[PDB]
Amino acid sequence: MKEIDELTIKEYGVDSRILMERAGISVVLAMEEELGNLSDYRFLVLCGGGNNGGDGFVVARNLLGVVKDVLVVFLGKKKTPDCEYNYGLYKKFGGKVVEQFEPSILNEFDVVVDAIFGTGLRGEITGEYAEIINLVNKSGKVVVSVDVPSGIDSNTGKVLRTAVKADLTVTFGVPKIGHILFPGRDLTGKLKVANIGHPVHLINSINRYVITREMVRSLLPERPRDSHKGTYGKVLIIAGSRLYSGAPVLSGMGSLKVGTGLVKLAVPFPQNLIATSRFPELISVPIDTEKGFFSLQNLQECLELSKDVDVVAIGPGLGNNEHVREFVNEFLKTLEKPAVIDADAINVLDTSVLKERKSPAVLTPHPGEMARLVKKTVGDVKYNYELAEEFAKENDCVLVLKSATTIVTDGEKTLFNITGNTGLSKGGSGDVLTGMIAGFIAQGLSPLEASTVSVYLHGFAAELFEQDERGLTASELLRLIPEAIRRLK
């Protein structure tokens, strides 16, 4: 987006003063929409020396005469040209500026406009800038951040030592990665994206997007009236073990609840019996195992079951021992169908086997599984969208890195999901997702499309739960899926 401001000035010819004005009035209009009539309020605008602060000067000037009181605390040393121009206007219009922050100054104001730093922040905040941010965060005033809350790194969502907690953030052109990933997404509060005059072609060129309702609506597969179950595909789910008898059932119904025509589970006996006793619509094939786990002895039976299907999901509750490893790796090596690879199938995966596969795969790890897979720490991989991009690209796969914001990438295109809530922070929610992806592939969506639609809907179903989110369980989530789908349309 830095390149987008640049191109809009330098090649399209839009004066940078005009972009700055449009940004500032956007902020004024966003505050009106959120606070109602502004004439009642007193405003403290905190301006740095960069263009973020310039945006602040525009806000401050625009509020002059219309609101109860305005004051600018200017906290930079030097001003950029556009910041300077606008400082100059604010002063000519009769606005008051000071350069010293008094702790007690929060006393006489209702709204703090945070125009200290924007996407123009490198490295940690210390000294007075930090002190003032800590003061604002303790003040209980309403906080409006210009562009990104000061102290968020706009490329990662990381807090650079300290950062402003905003009630409202007004950004320009497009959401930035920092608003989308945590902790930054938390500090952004309610996010508005303002159009400030960039050519639309540039806005759309952006290589990374947030999954939206509109995007998902247009990817949902059609339901032609003259159809039968085979129209909507077949899934095989290879899952469960004597230790984990629930996982297969939740994956299976994830597939069915998104509109798949037929789902078959392959689960060690007698645990296979659990599924059909809960959901007799499922087919649950007994696999005869030595000790409760899949092994190479079950390889041939599973390839056979996979000839009549469109997609295979593998992993949930398989257990992670050597015989499961041999089986999963030999199976994936021979299976010439799309694979959705989750949970324990990921823990035992040999990534050489993903490269040599002609057929496509989706991997769906959480950060702990991603860490072990690439042999890094949880902290190195969490929210690391470039690492996810490299891995999908190197292994010719779609990677769905699960978290409160989920990342879906194929190496070229990267998408971020922001639906869901803490109710999904419970075992078995992941199992449902695996099933949703496989089902959507079965219905003819590509792996990336299936993954995009599934993470969105999976989160949206969680938000539809009637009671406190913390009491949500995977079985209730399954029930809410078709409501999510209906509400999408």
Partner: peptide, 6 residues
């Protein structure tokens, strides 16, 4: 009220 009088 900021942008328009009607």
């Amino acid at each position: 009220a900021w942008l328009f009088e009607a």
